[PDB]
Amino acid sequence: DVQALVIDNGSGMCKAGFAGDDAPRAVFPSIVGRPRHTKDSYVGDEAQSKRGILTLKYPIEHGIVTNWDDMEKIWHHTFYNELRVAPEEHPVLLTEAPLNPKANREKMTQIMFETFNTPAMYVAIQAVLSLYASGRTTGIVMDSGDGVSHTVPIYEGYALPHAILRLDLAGRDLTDYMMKILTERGYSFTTTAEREIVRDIKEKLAYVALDFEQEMATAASSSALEKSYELPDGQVITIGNERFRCPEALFQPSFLGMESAGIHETTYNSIMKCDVDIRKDLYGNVVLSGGTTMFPGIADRMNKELTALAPSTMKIKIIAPPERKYSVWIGGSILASLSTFQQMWISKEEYDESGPSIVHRKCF
Amino acid sequence: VEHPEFLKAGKEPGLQIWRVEKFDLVPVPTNLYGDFFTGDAYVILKTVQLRNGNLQYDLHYWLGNECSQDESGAAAIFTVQLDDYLNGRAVQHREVQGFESATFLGYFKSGLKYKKGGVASGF
Ligand SMILES: Nc1ncnc2c1ncn2[C@@H]1O[C@H](COP(=O)(O)OP(=O)(O)OP(=O)(O)O)[C@@H](O)[C@H]1O
């Protein structure tokens, strides 16, 4: 009996744990810190807390690894410090962003076998794991995390690459936007600790309005929509229509000076790229996943917008599980735990024999 | 993948039912076909013989109202795996308790029955 590990490499947060558990044992910032002017490096929470003397780097951008040296450090730390395991003793399932470059898939594979000596490994597409976690084989996943939002149509277990689309706007962008609009109210949140306060405000007080214009009129007319927030000292601030204007940017990217379509349109557009014969199944299975889909009211709003774009005879169904922030990781935990998983992973033998390119024939 | 039960799957016309039991696919005794635990997830393979001799397949993953996430997720994945094993010849159907398709319901001569309970989650 062997124990597999599951690692979901997010652009903002890494989720790591043991297959079979219903939640990741470790969730920490995907950051590597190094001495600013001169322990050689730090990772995660400790790097973040020691930023005063460290230069921080985020090796994953838009779900794609951009620095392999730093990524090795995150993984090294994940194994030895966060999970407290010897990697050479465990099969490892890693997640990847949709449309992850072929070169990157091979790299990840080579690092696991050559650097960490994993006895076996597998790479799964994040969106697909989320669909599985929701108990479905067909549907369209709208995965929105840190730097990017993806719309991924999946049919009978497999994503349809040609129809995968993306909005280059996600959580960090919403946090930065909240920072900006809060200044118009006369608040300055510029430092790292201050940006963290803004993120908390976004995560705790923001919500998606079903009807934005009407929500704006309401805010302007009364103080019904106002909420109070207490800063780390004791200063209490008041936030109004910023609560819903912040996440509104997901639906109206022009709010950030972006020309691309909002998430509801991107979802509709991905659906229209699929064979008419399966579109009914996509509209009826819109699965939301990722931290940025956690805003109250987002499912109701997605339902409304998609219903407006689709024929009136199309049944629209938005699935927004409460645990959707870890949906990708949970899907991985289940997959890695199946009695049939032992045959799907790339083993050391296979790697030794075929090399990194084996990933394209074992994981697709 | 080639699980022992996969080797048994879709060999001749008829119905086969397995229950997801702690991350594994377990056959359901034939005498109990139609009796579904509402706290469980199942995989049903309906094999129909075609004129040329080959078999037609319809894979249904049935989800009880109280089945745990590991069970419904496993049922969905085993369904993709079984289809893959069957050369992609199976049409997959998601069947939720209380909202099953006429086709699925029609597989049970006397009508299927629901019973509270089931095997514990594998998490
Ligand atoms: N309750 C919440 N309301 C709104 N946003 C939230 C909430 N909880 C977390 N977030 C946001 O979700 C983002 C992190 O999401 P997530 O963990 O899904 O991304 P990731 O894995 O790191 O990113 P990606 O998939 O882009 O690689 C951050 O911007 C964070 O502020």
Ligand SMILES: [Ca+2]
């Ligand atoms: Ca059960």
Ligand SMILES: [Mg+2]
């Ligand atoms: Mg993610």
